[PDB]
Write an enzyme that holds these catalytic residues in place. Structure first.
Site, mmCIF file in Angstrom:
data_model
loop_
_atom_site.group_PDB
_atom_site.id
_atom_site.type_symbol
_atom_site.label_atom_id
_atom_site.label_comp_id
_atom_site.label_asym_id
_atom_site.label_seq_id
_atom_site.Cartn_x
_atom_site.Cartn_y
_atom_site.Cartn_z
ATOM 1 C CG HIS A 1 44.112 46.520 15.662
ATOM 2 N ND1 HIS A 1 45.238 45.801 15.304
ATOM 3 C CD2 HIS A 1 43.278 45.630 16.257
ATOM 4 C CE1 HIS A 1 45.103 44.541 15.689
ATOM 5 N NE2 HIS A 1 43.926 44.410 16.274
ATOM 6 C CE1 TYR B 1 39.260 39.418 9.086
ATOM 7 C CE2 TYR B 1 39.523 39.051 11.436
ATOM 8 C CZ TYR B 1 40.030 39.490 10.240
ATOM 9 O OH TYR B 1 41.322 40.007 10.177
ATOM 10 C CB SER C 1 42.052 37.998 14.471
ATOM 11 O OG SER C 1 43.131 38.711 13.872
ATOM 12 C CB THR D 1 46.171 38.906 11.791
ATOM 13 O OG1 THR D 1 45.742 40.004 11.001
ATOM 14 C CG2 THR D 1 46.440 39.397 13.194
HETATM 15 C C1 LIG Z 1 44.903 28.448 25.560
HETATM 16 O O1 LIG Z 1 44.781 29.569 24.670
HETATM 17 C C2 LIG Z 1 45.738 30.571 24.613
HETATM 18 C C3 LIG Z 1 46.974 30.335 25.243
HETATM 19 C C4 LIG Z 1 47.986 31.294 25.223
HETATM 20 C C5 LIG Z 1 47.768 32.511 24.574
HETATM 21 CL CL1 LIG Z 1 49.072 33.753 24.551
HETATM 22 C C6 LIG Z 1 46.543 32.760 23.947
HETATM 23 C C7 LIG Z 1 45.514 31.806 23.956
HETATM 24 S S1 LIG Z 1 44.148 32.213 23.191
HETATM 25 O O2 LIG Z 1 43.019 32.106 24.086
HETATM 26 O O3 LIG Z 1 44.324 33.599 22.862
HETATM 27 N N1 LIG Z 1 43.886 31.254 21.851
HETATM 28 C C8 LIG Z 1 42.796 30.239 21.884
HETATM 29 C C9 LIG Z 1 42.756 29.650 20.462
HETATM 30 C C10 LIG Z 1 43.253 30.831 19.657
HETATM 31 C C11 LIG Z 1 43.147 31.057 18.276
HETATM 32 C C12 LIG Z 1 42.490 30.118 17.312
HETATM 33 C C13 LIG Z 1 43.669 32.226 17.748
HETATM 34 C C14 LIG Z 1 44.297 33.153 18.583
HETATM 35 C C15 LIG Z 1 44.831 34.416 17.983
HETATM 36 O O4 LIG Z 1 45.710 34.378 17.137
HETATM 37 N N2 LIG Z 1 44.250 35.523 18.453
HETATM 38 C C16 LIG Z 1 44.371 36.791 18.013
HETATM 39 C C17 LIG Z 1 43.243 37.628 17.996
HETATM 40 C C18 LIG Z 1 43.384 38.943 17.552
HETATM 41 C C19 LIG Z 1 44.628 39.455 17.138
HETATM 42 C C20 LIG Z 1 44.681 40.903 16.669
HETATM 43 O O5 LIG Z 1 45.707 41.492 16.287
HETATM 44 O O6 LIG Z 1 43.638 41.553 16.654
HETATM 45 C C21 LIG Z 1 45.754 38.606 17.172
HETATM 46 CL CL2 LIG Z 1 47.417 39.104 16.688
HETATM 47 C C22 LIG Z 1 45.613 37.288 17.617
HETATM 48 C C23 LIG Z 1 44.396 32.928 19.968
HETATM 49 C C24 LIG Z 1 43.849 31.752 20.502
HETATM 50 C C1 LIG Z 2 38.932 38.549 24.605
HETATM 51 C C2 LIG Z 2 39.862 39.650 24.117
HETATM 52 C C3 LIG Z 2 39.240 40.414 22.948
HETATM 53 C C4 LIG Z 2 40.033 41.655 22.549
HETATM 54 C C5 LIG Z 2 40.980 41.260 21.417
HETATM 55 C C6 LIG Z 2 42.114 42.248 21.141
HETATM 56 C C7 LIG Z 2 42.322 42.437 19.626
HETATM 57 C C8 LIG Z 2 40.989 42.772 18.938
HETATM 58 O O1 LIG Z 2 41.154 43.268 17.611
HETATM 59 C C9 LIG Z 2 39.875 43.397 16.977
HETATM 60 O O2 LIG Z 2 39.698 42.339 16.034
HETATM 61 C C10 LIG Z 2 38.526 42.359 15.202
HETATM 62 C C11 LIG Z 2 38.696 41.288 14.126
HETATM 63 O O3 LIG Z 2 38.492 40.021 14.755
HETATM 64 C C12 LIG Z 2 38.301 43.703 14.510
HETATM 65 O O4 LIG Z 2 37.009 43.682 13.882
HETATM 66 C C13 LIG Z 2 38.448 44.867 15.488
HETATM 67 O O5 LIG Z 2 38.382 46.081 14.735
HETATM 68 C C14 LIG Z 2 39.755 44.759 16.285
HETATM 69 O O6 LIG Z 2 39.805 45.749 17.309
#
Ligand SMILES: COc1ccc(Cl)cc1S(=O)(=O)N1CCc2c(C)cc(C(=O)Nc3ccc(C(=O)O)c(Cl)c3)cc21
Ligand SMILES: CCCCCCCCO[C@@H]1O[C@H](CO)[C@@H](O)[C@H](O)[C@H]1O
Length: 625
Positions: free
Chosen positions: A341, A455, A457, A468
């Site tokens: 990560h 939490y 993300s 993030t």
């Molecule tokens: C219709 O929903 C989507 C449409 C297009 C995409 Cl690319 C993603 C989604 S989603 O399912 O991923 N989406 C739903 C609402 C939402 C929220 C509130 C946050 C995020 C988000 O920023 N997710 C996320 C989670 C984890 C990481 C990480 O680095 O671990 C990162 Cl960069 C980003 C995605 C989504």
């Molecule tokens: C449905 C898809 C789930 C997999 C998401 C890919 C990125 C996950 O990222 C995760 O985020 C968590 C914080 O929210 C951390 O606690 C974890 O260590 C980290 O791996």
């Protein structure tokens, strides 16, 4: 050609003009911090925290903020959080396994026979190198979040914007409500690894390398996937080399080296140096610089629990955990990207993941009837060998004991809630993400009778070097709504619960937009703590408050990414008494994959989540509870 995409706009066209990541007003960070504390603290804990907050805001925090701003203004080429955040990952000494590395699993190829392991490993691998080639050529379409896809995401917009210089191009997309994203993390997707060192790990990249690293039964293999001209090696030749690897009948080594990548980071830093001392630098250089790591597992998946264990950690012999990512392909064609990560986030992995799934399945390199090229794979493919001293062997035994013993304590289970998903929830004027998050708050009240640090993300990739921001879904509204559903279903009408759910949703949507805009509190407070430490100052009293430590002991740790390419994801809890909740709201159903250690129970939690979603949907349907 070797390109999975042909963008007329250069991949990197927007990067120079991306808006700088905003530093909030300290007053707004403090308020937001206290708002997220309201649901978590008894009244005297809160007034203790409120007073530390005022002391901070008027004093040392005011001064840290002043320097953070001035520092940012000196460094307008980057983001205020970029260094601190990298340092967060890389200084951490805990195993990256479970603490940090998540996975995302592919849906199968919808063509049944294309899920043969050799066919699918060749196809996924070749689509991955095609991604590498397309990114290198600037032919990958730029990442852009569209408010109005129908109008801005159009051939016609693209033919115009390509003429705007990168110094101004962002502005053009902004004026048609399109929001280009940072793509700087794609520098480390390939040929990249995390190297263990004392104090702070190192991120290593070697762009000149042309070879693949494959892991099978914990044996290490390399072969070129790019020739000397920069072209992809013929897929039928790649298929022969993979077939050849799949024919090795050597059993698992007595000391599998991959174990070491699961160790505490100081232990591994030390053992790696011994490996160099004992003359393994060349071997390590070949592991480190590989395009990525392909893991070939010789069992099929029994169920989704087995799948999640496999793609999240495996048995410790067959993942090179430090590598930018491991592309895993099991005996039944089940595949996933397991990734490290520190170098980048879910958003950049998702693009790579979506492009490779699309390419591998719609434009496959080979078919399940393809005949491997006549070629001598003992010449093309090198089996690596590590020279293991007595200390290295003892090191590997100890890595294995720690791995096995820690992994035994991890449980993972899942639910597929089938009554509804996005479609029903949007019809009801509710944010589907807020509904999922309310269900987790509500389930935890039901199971444990507490409100706990939560939490979620959120990408800040809309800004230059953004990573993030934390969304804090546990609010006074989810708490009051959870109390209403769990503690006195009698007291309230369906109308009131509906309205209560609508207030959660409005607040959640607000925190969401703020977090994406860099207007959360977590990163900002973290960067001030980081700055104080980097200046050699005592850690301010704000950060010593148990209510601060408690805010960052995330018992409910949640994450969602969705796409047609992803079947499910998984990650372990961040704390020993926590859950790791990977979820997705689909059009028709809600999926959660939940992990826990011994100090919690994922199975009961999912039962409480299931029950909570049924009560949520009833109340929304017009029925009582
Ligand atoms: C219709 O929903 C989507 C449409 C297009 C995409 Cl690319 C993603 C989604 S989603 O399912 O991923 N989406 C739903 C609402 C939402 C929220 C509130 C946050 C995020 C988000 O920023 N997710 C996320 C989670 C984890 C990481 C990480 O680095 O671990 C990162 Cl960069 C980003 C995605 C989504
Ligand atoms: C449905 C898809 C789930 C997999 C998401 C890919 C990125 C996950 O990222 C995760 O985020 C968590 C914080 O929210 C951390 O606690 C974890 O260590 C980290 O791996």
């Amino acid at each position: 050609d070797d390109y999975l995409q042909h963008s007329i706009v250069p991949t990197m066209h927007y990067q120079d003009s991306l808006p700088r990541l905003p530093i909030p007003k300290l007053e707004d960070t403090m308020k937001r911090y206290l708002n997220a504390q309201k649901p978590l603290l008894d009244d005297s804990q809160f007034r203790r925290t409120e007073a530390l907050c005022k002391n901070f805001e008027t004093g040392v925090g005011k001064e840290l903020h002043a320097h953070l701003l001035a520092q940012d203004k000196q460094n307008k080429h980057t983001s205020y959080i970029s260094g601190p955040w990298f340092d967060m990952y890389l200084t951490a000494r805990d195993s990256i396994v479970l603490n940090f590395n998540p996975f995302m699993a592919f849906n199968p190829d919808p063509k049944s026979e294309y899920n043969d392991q050799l066919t699918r490993a060749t196809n996924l691998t070749v689509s991955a190198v095609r991604f590498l080639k397309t990114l290198q050529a600037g032919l990958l379409e730029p990442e852009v979040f569209h408010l109005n896809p129908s109008k801005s995401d159009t051939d016609a917009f693209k033919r115009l914007i390509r003429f705007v210089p990168p110094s101004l191009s962002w502005y053009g997309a902004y004026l048609v409500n399109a929001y280009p994203l940072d793509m700087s993390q794609y520098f480390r997707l390939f040929n990249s690894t995390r190297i263990p060192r004392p104090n702070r790990d190192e991120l290593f990249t070697d762009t000149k390398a042309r070879h693949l690293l494959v892991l099978r039964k914990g044996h290490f293999y390399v072969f070129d996937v790019l020739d000397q001209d920069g072209n992809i090696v013929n897929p039928l030749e790649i298929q022969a080399h993979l077939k050849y690897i799949l024919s090795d009948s050597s059993p698992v080594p007595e000391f599998p080296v991959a174990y070491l990548t699961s160790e505490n980071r100081d232990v591994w830093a030390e053992l790696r140096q011994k490996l160099i001392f004992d003359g393994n630098e060349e071997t390590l250089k070949k592991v480190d610089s590989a395009v990525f790591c392909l893991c070939l597992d010789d069992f099929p998946m029994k169920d989704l629990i087995h799948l999640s264990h496999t793609m999240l950690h495996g048995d410790g012999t067959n993942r090179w955990f430090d590598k930018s990512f491991n592309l895993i392909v099991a005996e039944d064609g089940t595949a996933a990207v397991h990734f490290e990560h520190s170098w980048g986030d879910g958003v950049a992995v998702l693009r790579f993941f979506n492009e490779v799934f699309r390419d591998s399945t719609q434009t496959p390199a080979i078919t399940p009837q393809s005949q491997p090229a006549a070629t001598n794979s003992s010449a093309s493919v090198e089996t690596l060998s590590f020279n293991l001293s007595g200390a290295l062997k003892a090191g590997i035994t100890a890595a294995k004991e720690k791995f096995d013993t820690t992994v035994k304590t991890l449980s993972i289970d899942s639910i597929q809630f089938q009554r509804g998903g996005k479609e029903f929830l949007k019809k009801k004027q509710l944010s589907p993400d807020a509904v999922a998050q309310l269900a987790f708050q509500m389930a935890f009240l039901r199971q444990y009778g507490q409100t706990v640090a939560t939490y979620e993300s959120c990408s800040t990739a809309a800004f230059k070097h953004g990573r993030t921001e934390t969304i804090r879904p546990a609010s006074i509204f989810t708490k009051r709504c959870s109390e209403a559903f769990v503690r006195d279903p009698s007291k309230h009408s369906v109308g009131e619960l509906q309205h209560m759910m609508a207030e959660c949703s409005k607040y959640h949507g607000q925190l969401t937009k703020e977090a994406a805009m860099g207007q959360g509190f977590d990163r900002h407070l973290y960067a001030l703590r980081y700055l104080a430490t980097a200046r050699g100052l005592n850690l301010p009293e704000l950060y010593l408050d148990p209510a601060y430590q408690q805010m960052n002991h995330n018992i409910l740790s949640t994450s969602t990414l969705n796409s047609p390419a992803v079947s499910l994801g998984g990650f372990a809890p961040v704390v020993p008494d926590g859950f790791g909740i990977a979820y997705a709201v689909h059009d028709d159903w809600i999926g959660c994959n939940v992990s826990s250690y011994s100090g919690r129970n994922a199975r009961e939690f999912l039962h409480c989540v299931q029950k909570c979603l049924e009560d949520i949907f009833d109340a929304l349907e017009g029925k009582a509870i």
